[PDB]
């Protein structure tokens, strides 16, 4: 029923995360946390503002879109650490992948 929600102007002040450290392997997706409010006053879950961006660029992939998910997935084995920015806060994820098949 609800689509297409335009916005005023973009005024971050703060934001809190809650990411998780879990392990993944045979294909797995960790499910993260994330809450954003804005300096007007409020509080809104929002995971698509959150820029997410991990060393290893295979393993490097996240599922940021639906509403506040930020799930991510790994490809790759090794310690891919998952960086989080957003306004003047950021956020911290680690997720440990052992990738044995090719």
């Excluded at 005023?8 to 450290?21: C, D, M, R, V, W």
């Excluded at 994330?34 to 300096?39: E, F, I, L, Q, R």
């Excluded at 698509?48 to 295979?58: I, L, P």
């Amino acid at each position: 029923e609800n689509i297409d929600i335009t916005v005023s102007a973009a005024t971050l002040s703060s934001i809190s995360i809650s990411p998780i450290n879990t392990n993944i392997n045979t294909t797995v997706s960790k499910q993260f946390f994330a809450v954003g409010t804005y300096s007007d006053g409020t509080k809104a879950d929002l995971t698509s503002s959150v820029t997410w961006s991990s060393s290893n660029q295979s393993q490097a992939k996240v599922s940021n879109a639906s509403e506040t998910k930020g799930l991510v997935t790994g490809i790759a084995s090794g310690n891919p650490t998952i960086i989080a920015t957003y306004g003047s806060v950021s956020g911290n994820t680690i997720l440990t992948v052992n990738k044995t098949d090719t």
